[PDB]
């Protein structure tokens, strides 16, 4: 209950009663298929069920604002440090097509040896707590009621306290999450023994909750000297995590591979990345493909980022993607803004719909260079498996730097990351289960001696205590806050003020940030400092240059800047004036056919402008089906006046270009005077225009409507059916 399209989200009210909040549902949801789905004039071969409410692409206006949705779950990453600002962004993206919202954790959460509580402020992510998760899911339950399609909510289970987060996530109905033992070992130097003993329980809890599981392999792209050499390693990592998760009980159809195409132009990226994609998908038949986008080969140009994301999407379309995740185009430039998550989702939706049913017309030449390379990659990865075995196992191979090595396996440069089996965070916190070890709950992985307390309860070890929190949700302990200044509550009294004024933001309410794009006719360095000056001279604060592209060394430089705006504006103190369509006009001149007489009057030889508003070339009255009987140039006062008569016309239209002695505004007179002086001036209309002509000093000449510098055909035709829907 709540949520109307035109009323903002009551963020205040959502935080109320969180202690009494239950997730409306559990597990992951895919999108619905829509066989031969018709939308407007088109049939779609790869679409999903449409949304009840959404925001269609801009050029959807030319097709009845149809907003078709592709078959893959579209992801968006939202997490700015203040989850309560984020909620508002989620509703934005949700309407723009996103049904998978992924919240990155606050910097370093892996190292938190336990859950945390309440709503501390984050950095580079949101601190993940039971309160903050309840808030977002509660809010999303509304946003998915509104848009009319379930949204999967997603965060991370990584770190030394996976079992912990996994319990809370399973409880609070989180739908998907990352969990990869290898992630903790290679990138957070968590101790390898305890990382893997832990993942068994993590993955079992997520198997229970029916969560989608994404793996960590996309981190091997980030950490590689050259990404186009890491593929044999990716394969190994995708494999070790998958076969591990399968055997823990996780469903083969809930196990997703985080797979980013390794390169970007100017690298011949399709050529390099298409075989790996094909290879991986053949070799990993059965598992789900979670396609991610490029972040390694990226910079401050959002245009460049978008161009590479479309080729990224092309890889997914030429192969397959169960989940198609996104990256905001400004990613390499600043922490993601509201507008750029919406660029992300728009881009994804548009390119995929643009490729609808492409595979009924395009197919992979699977035999040729493509097929050979697919082979070779499989073989390198099989070799990689073999050397891991020959060296005594996984732990040994990690001890030996098999991983994160800048070589192209089997090449080994000897610069990979070595972790010590007995070393790392959480070293020496591994305990052996005793013969009488026991664990009284649902979803425990390892040895569990229930039969000592009751043979019959072995398959429901939770009964020993009449249900655990997975069965009995009231047994859960809610905690509101622990810090008392570092909480959402404080942060939001901090700006009750704006929640009846208004100012710009990029992530947080009234953060005042805005983007300035300019070109300057000088070297890149000079202009960089030049821009900051114009910026301050524009009253902007905290100015900094966020992107700089050369047009040419001497001629000029593209510069983009962010700055804060040091003042607000009242919506109340804004003055705002309270659309005759293309189709409304073409249709009038059908029910009631219409005709015109046009000429360039005086001794005016200029024919260009008059012609400009008649010739269909530039959408002149001609386009709309008006009958035009042109008379030429130098046409005299009367020959034009006589004509409307001699031809039976519903309007005269004349132009004046030459202006000396006010010859223009002048002629409109003798035209209106000789239009009444004859007796046509009340069942006819009369319009004129020219270089020097204002629609005002034109009504003050007797003629009905004026048209000045910059008048298109739309302006004339719109008027010609209006001054006729009054008289007639």
């Amino acid at each position: 209950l709540q949520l109307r399209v035109n009323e903002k989200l009551d963020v205040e009210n959502i935080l109320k009663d969180l202690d009494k909040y239950t997730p409306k549902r559990r597990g992951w949801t895919w999108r619905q298929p829509a066989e031969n789905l018709q939308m407007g004039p088109f049939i779609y071969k790869d679409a999903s069920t449409p949304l009840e409410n959404s925001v269609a692409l801009p050029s959807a206006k030319y097709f009845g604002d149809i907003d078709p949705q592709p078959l893959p779950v579209i992801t968006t990453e939202i997490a700015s440090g203040r989850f309560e600002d984020d909620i508002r962004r989620m509703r934005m993206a949700a309407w723009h097509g996103a049904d998978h919202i992924m919240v990155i954790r606050t910097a370093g959460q892996s190292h938190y040896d336990g859950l945390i509580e309440g709503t501390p402020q984050g950095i580079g992510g949101v601190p993940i707590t039971r309160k903050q998760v309840r808030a977002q899911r509660k809010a999303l339950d509304l946003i998915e009621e509104e848009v009319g399609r379930p949204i999967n909510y997603h965060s991370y289970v990584s770190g030394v306290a996976g079992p912990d987060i996994a319990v809370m996530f399973a409880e609070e109905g989180v739908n998907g999450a990352h969990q990869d033992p290898q992630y903790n070992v290679l990138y957070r130097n968590i101790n390898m023994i305890r990382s893997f003993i832990d993942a068994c329980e993590s993955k079992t809890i997520m198997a229970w909750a029916d969560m989608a599981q994404i793996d960590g392999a996309h981190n091997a792209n980030a950490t590689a000297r050259e990404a186009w050499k890491v593929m044999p390693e990716l394969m190994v990592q995708h494999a070790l995590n998958s076969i591990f998760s399968l055997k823990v009980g996780m469903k083969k159809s809930n196990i997703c591979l985080s797979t980013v195409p390794p390169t970007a132009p100017p690298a011949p990226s399709m050529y390099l990345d298409l075989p790996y994609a094909v290879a991986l998908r053949e070799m990993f038949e059965g598992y789900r493909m979670r396609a991610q986008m490029n972040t390694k080969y990226m910079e401050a140009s959002t245009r460049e980022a978008t161009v590479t994301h479309v080729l990224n999407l092309l890889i997914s379309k030429l192969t397959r993607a169960d989940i198609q995740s996104t990256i905001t185009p400004d990613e390499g430039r600043n922490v993601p803004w509201h507008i750029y998550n919406i660029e992300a989702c728009d881009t994804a939706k548009q390119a995929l719909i643009g490729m609808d049913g492409l595979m009924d017309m395009v197919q992979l030449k699977r035999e040729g260079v493509l097929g050979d390379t697919v082979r070779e990659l499989k073989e390198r990865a099989v070799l990689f498996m073999e050397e891991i075995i020959e060296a005594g196992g996984y732990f040994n191979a990690v001890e030996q730097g098999f991983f994160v090595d800048s070589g192209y396996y089997p090449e080994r440069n000897g610069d990979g990351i070595a972790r010590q089996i007995n070393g790392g965070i959480g070293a020496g916190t591994v305990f052996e289960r005793d013969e009488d070890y026991m664990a009284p709950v649902t979803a425990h992985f390892g040895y569990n001696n229930v039969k000592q307390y009751d043979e019959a309860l072995v398959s429901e070890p939770s009964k020993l205590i009449d249900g655990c929190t997975l069965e009995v949700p009231e047994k859960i302990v809610y905690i509101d806050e622990l810090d008392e200044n570092d909480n959402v509550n404080v942060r939001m009294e901090e700006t009750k003020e704006f929640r009846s004024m208004i100012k710009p933001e990029v992530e947080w309410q009234a953060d005042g940030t805005v983007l300035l794009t300019m070109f300057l006719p000088t070297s890149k360095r000079v202009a960089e400092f030049a821009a900051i000056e114009f910026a301050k001279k524009m009253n902007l604060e905290e100015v900094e240059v966020i992107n700089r592209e050369v047009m040419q060394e001497a001629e000029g430089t593209r510069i983009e800047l962010k700055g804060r705006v040091p003042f607000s504006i009242d919506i109340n103190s804004l003055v705002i004036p309270p659309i005759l369509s293309e189709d409304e006009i073409r249709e009038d001149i059908e029910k009631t056919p219409l005709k015109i007489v046009a000429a360039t009057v005086g001794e005016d030889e200029h024919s260009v402008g008059l012609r400009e508003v008649i010739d269909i070339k530039h959408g002149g009255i001609e386009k709309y089906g008006v009958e035009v009987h042109y008379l030429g140039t130098s046409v005299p006062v009367e020959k034009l006046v006589d004509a409307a008569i001699e031809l039976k016309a519903d309007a005269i239209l004349a132009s004046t270009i030459i202006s000396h002695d006010d010859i223009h505004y002048k002629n409109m007179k003798r035209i209106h005077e000789l239009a009444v002086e004859k007796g046509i001036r009340d069942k006819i209309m009369i319009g004129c225009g020219g270089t020097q002509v204002t629609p005002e000093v034109a009504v003050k000449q007797g003629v009905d409507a004026g048209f000045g510098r910059g008048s298109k055909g739309i302006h004339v035709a719109t008027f010609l059916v209006k001054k006729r829907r009054e008289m007639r």
Binding site: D164, G426, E432
Partner: protein, 110 residues
Amino acid sequence: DDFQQRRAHLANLSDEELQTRFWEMAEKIVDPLLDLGKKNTTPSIERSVLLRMGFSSLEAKAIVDKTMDRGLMGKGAGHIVYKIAKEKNISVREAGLALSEGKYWDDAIQ
């Protein structure tokens, strides 16, 4: 390549041999890892048990911290809380709060 003389023994495998070999070995690698998770535990696995039994993160750290100090991890933090609840005829909840404050660790060592 190196690679050439490395791949030599795969040269003649069919794609299916090659793929099933890929997975055969993956599984050979992870088996000793999964077997470690059956036979052992950790502070976070044990805390995660306590969360399921109805204790807060705060209360769970408290119990496991103390469980490690008494060299009792191998019996199971939840098993500890359960046996005590039974023996001193209280509630799983009471026994926990109790244990998290230092009471009963004596009785548990037997």
